[PDB]
Paper text:
It encompasses an N-terminal domain (NTD) and a C-terminal domain (CTD).
We observed a strong positive difference map peak connected to the hydroxyl side chain of residue S78 of wildtype TglT, which was absent in D82A. SEP78 fitted the electron density of a composite omit map calculated with simulated annealing. Specifically, the phosphate of SEP78 is virtually located at the very center of the cavity, where it stays in proximity to all residues inside the cavity. The distances measured from the phosphate group to residues G62 (motif 1), D80 and D82 (motif 2), K189 (motif 3) and D208 (motif 4) range from 3.9 Å to 6.4 Å. The molecular surface analysis of the TglT structure demonstrated that the phosphorylation of S78 may not only influence the local electrostatic charge in the central cavity, but also introduce a protrusion on the right-side wall of the cavity which can potentially block access to the cavity. Collectively, our crystallographic data suggest that the phosphate group may inhibit the activity of TglT and in turn the toxicity. A fragment 71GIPDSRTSKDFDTVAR86 from wildtype TglT was observed; the calculated molecular mass for S78 was 184.9984 Da, matching the theoretical molecular mass of phosphoserine, 185.07 Da, confirming that S78 was phosphorylated. To test our hypothesis, we first compared the GTP binding affinity of the phosphorylated and non-phosphorylated TglT species. It was evident that the phosphorylated TglT exhibited lower GTP binding affinity than the non-phosphorylated TglT, which supports the theory that SEP78 impairs GTP binding.
Numbering used by the authors: 4 to 292
The structure:
């Protein structure tokens, strides 16, 4: 177990190689996970004047934090929800990246807005160029979206020991959007009907929705039902409860989304996945306050 932090990039990549092989994961998956953790630590330093998070992590990065690399889909985006205007978010991140964290620094590209149907303030996308001790390390796509209903009223705090395993001991603690709101948002996305030039490709959300249902265990579903109502009404598109339809090109997209998850108990076909998620929708709608 390394007693000092990596003295340079080459030492860091070499150490990541060894832990990846020891853990039986793909090197590039572990390296991308570490880049995401670093970006998340920068985001965790962003706080209002009472000390509460300004940014909550969501999406595939959140699921990898909750379940670990072996039990989560491979994803690349670092999706977040902000409680402040994004022009404030970008500058605060750029400040945090210059100061750095445990030898990591980052520079952020300019934010570009994205068109959306159902939120008045459009999300933003930019990239983080990471370096470790002066030398470029990795790039992370970043998406920042605005709060919806109560989806930033609370947060879970997740961790990862990946950097500790390579000799960087500082504690990792990442504020994340809670599961009820992740479910609401993925249920809306996976059932959305997009206009004629576009087509919904989000079969992978059917995998994540199965994973999120498992994470809720025997919890009461009332908070999830409430979150689902709030998001579907907030967006004012298709109504709650939706129909979990599959599109003709989804069979192979869903199969792609299962890559590396053979050891889990998941629906193995897109039809069975849609059936599972439809049962979850009905069970959510049933919950009685
Ligand atoms: Mg706190
Ligand atoms: Mg989500
Ligand atoms: Mg995602
Ligand atoms: Mg996968
Ligand atoms: Mg996002
Ligand atoms: Mg709430
Ligand atoms: Mg908050
Ligand atoms: Mg659809
Ligand atoms: Mg709950
Ligand atoms: Mg559909
Ligand atoms: Mg097929
Ligand atoms: Mg499986
Ligand atoms: Mg069921």
């Amino acid at each position: 177990p390394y007693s000092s932090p990596p003295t340079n990039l080459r030492s860091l990549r070499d150490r990541l190689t060894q832990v990846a092989e020891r853990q039986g994961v793909v090197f590039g998956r572990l390296q991308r996970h570490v880049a995401m953790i670093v970006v998340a630590q920068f985001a965790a330093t962003l706080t209002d004047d009472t000390g509460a998070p300004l940014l909550l992590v969501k999406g595939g990065s959140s699921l990898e934090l909750r379940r670990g690399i072996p039990d989560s889909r491979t994803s690349k985006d670092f999706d977040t929800v902000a409680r402040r205007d994004i022009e404030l978010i970008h500058e605060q991140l750029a400040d945090a990246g210059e100061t750095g964290w445990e030898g990591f620094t980052a520079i952020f590209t300019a934010p570009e807005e994205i068109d959306v149907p159902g939120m008045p303030v459009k999300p933003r996308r930019f990239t983080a160029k990471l370096s470790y001790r002066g030398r470029a390390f990795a790039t992370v796509p970043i998406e920042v979206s605005s709060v919806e209903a109560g989806n930033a009223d609370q947060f879970d705090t997740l961790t990862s020991d990946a950097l500790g395993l390579v000799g960087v001991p500082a504690a990792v603690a990442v504020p994340c959007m809670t599961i009820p709101w992740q479910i609401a948002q993925k249920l809306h996305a996976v059932t959305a009907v997009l206009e004629e030039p576009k087509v919904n490709d989000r079969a992978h959300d059917l995998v994540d929705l199965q994973l999120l249902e498992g994470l809720l265990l025997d919890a009461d579903l009332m908070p999830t039902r409430s979150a689902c109502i709030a998001i579907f009404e907030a967006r004012a598109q298709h109504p709650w409860p939706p129909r979990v339809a599959t599109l003709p090109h989804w069979p192979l997209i869903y199969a792609g989304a299962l890559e590396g998850l053979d050891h889990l108990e998941l629906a193995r076909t897109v039809d069975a996945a849609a059936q599972a998620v439809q049962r979850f929708v009905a069970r959510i709608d049933r919950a009685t306050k």
